[PDB]
Amino acid sequence: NNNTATLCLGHHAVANGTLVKTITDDQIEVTNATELVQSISMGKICNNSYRILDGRNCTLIDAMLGDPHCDVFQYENWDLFIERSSAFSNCYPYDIPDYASLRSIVASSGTLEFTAEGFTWTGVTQNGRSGACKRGSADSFFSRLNWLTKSGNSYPTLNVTMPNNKNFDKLYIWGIHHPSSNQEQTKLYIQESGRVTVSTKRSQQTIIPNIGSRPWVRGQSGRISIYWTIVKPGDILMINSNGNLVAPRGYFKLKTGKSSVMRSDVPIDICVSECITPNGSISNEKPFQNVNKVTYGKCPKYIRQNTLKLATGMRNVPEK
């Protein structure tokens, strides 16, 4: 027919569509879709967006304390500290009350900037050392801690002051030594029992030692418990002890920080990615991720689904 035409309206389709989920349909085919869930890591932790520190065989605390094999980390600072699982302590055995909170505070602040200070320890021997804590091939000790003992036949009451004239909080790491026997307590410290009282205008922490055997660790049936005290601008640090003091040598600086600490065992490498997980860095194109709930940086949100396809085309209705 020459005096009629035909005009049909339509829409496109594709040979290969993709299935998506809607409200009314469990599955339904669209021309195109895009994946909104990051389920693949890069295999490695990328080091060019944020400043990453490989902890190697050192925990962040052992680095802070100054375990001799952790000396390469003196004064290091980071955006993210990576703790390996094969990390081990290799100095005098210790325990830290509320370990997690100190690790967190150090992780958070993001630095191990240590400033030594002029402590006067009248009437005692300083720089006490030990076979448990070899440095060189010589007995030694945690480098940031000063293990004090008797001089001649005395250990007079130690009463020292140290004010904070800075505009930042100082953090002091100190300890108390718990000896293995009365035979040792007296030999080292003269007095039959120690006392250690680290105080400020606001806070105070006394600790008494506790003689007795603990399990053998690197030659040691005794222990050192580690404590910390923060000192705010204008405040003042006071230490009072008539035995067993593992003293501080200085302070760490505390910063309002963006820093943190992660536990991973994956290789650090040069790439670029602004999201880090223990499985390695992951891309952050997508809004969600299913790699790990532990993240650091600009990260997609963790969720329990591994796939979420968002339709980026119309419904696909093929031909024949």
Binding site: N3, P287, G297, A311
Partner: protein, 172 residues
Amino acid sequence: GIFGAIAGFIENGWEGMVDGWYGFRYQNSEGTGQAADLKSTQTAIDQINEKLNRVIERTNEKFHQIEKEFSEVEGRIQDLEKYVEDTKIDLWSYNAELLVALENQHTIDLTDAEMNKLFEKTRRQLRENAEDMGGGCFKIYHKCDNACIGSIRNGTYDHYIYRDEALNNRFQ
């Protein structure tokens, strides 16, 4: 789709339409032909890109948080730390599930909408010179060389020109 155009009164799509999401196929005295409608294509594309702008490369900086794995057994505090994270994930997982289902439901609807809008835009243009044959096809009751189809495509078709010829092939 709620408008019954796609996967509805239009029976299938055209794999042959490479250069547009929506368009025309036609037959007249000069042969047959096909053209894409760019405006509908762009409305549907812009709409989808706007959903897309609202999710891709839109992540958020988070620094030091709480621990989510635990080598030791602690009880009360660790119970809380774990419950807090568990609760968070469940709530984002819910959110992400809903977001995608709704957005996809909506993408299917508004692409059905554009098909329908075009089909109406064209019917309104043809006035009484044409009938809906079904299947998304109009029978035009008058000689219609390609330039005339062109006028329909580009929104300039004038029904008063063909109204007498059309009403006469249609009735009576």
